[PDB]
Prior knowledge:
The structure is a homodimer. Chain A contains four helices and no strands. The longest helix of chain A is centred in the middle third of the chain and has 15 residues. Chain A is globular, with a radius of gyration of 11 Å. Chain A has a single domain, classed as Winged helix-like DNA-binding domain superfamily/Winged helix DNA-binding domain (Arc Repressor Mutant, subunit A). Chain A is an all-alpha fold. Chains A and B meet through helix 4 of A and helix 3 of B. The structure holds a DNA duplex. It is classed as transcription/dna.
Amino acid sequence: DPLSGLTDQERTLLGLLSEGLTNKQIADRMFLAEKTVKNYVSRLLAKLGMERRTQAAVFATELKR
Amino acid sequence: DPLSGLTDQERTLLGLLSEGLTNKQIADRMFLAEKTVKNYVSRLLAKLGMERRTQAAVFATELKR
DNA sequence: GCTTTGGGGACTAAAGTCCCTAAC
DNA sequence: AGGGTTAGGGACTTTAGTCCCCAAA
């Protein structure tokens, strides 16, 4: 449960990622632009030591359980 | 645990997918080409009623636990 | 005069889709 | 030997991702 380091919405970029959504879908759910999302997510992977959104999801998926 | 329908290696295309690997990484671990894997995976998502490999992975991740 | 917090530019690269061949 | 698996090319269209810099609050 190492969610220490993730901003407000970065922990909520993990739950949307873990529902195998697309940047643009996750975008609408948050009122951003897809470009904005691409950024936040790509930062978040860096913060996580991962290089693919899929790893983030599975990792998130493991926390939720 | 609905792995009924999945061929031999389709159940193993779900364990590799669930490690957030890439078609080409997955393809090395299976001795295929990346093109070959693009196809297998894409079929497998159809068989699963999903349209994005991330979904597959999370779903797979939920079975493993 | 700064921190958050949102997004364009500008691509490089993965992912996916569909349909159609060969090799056992 | 005309058939099912099992593997991949063609040929793109879409999402993802990367970095770095730019304004509003």
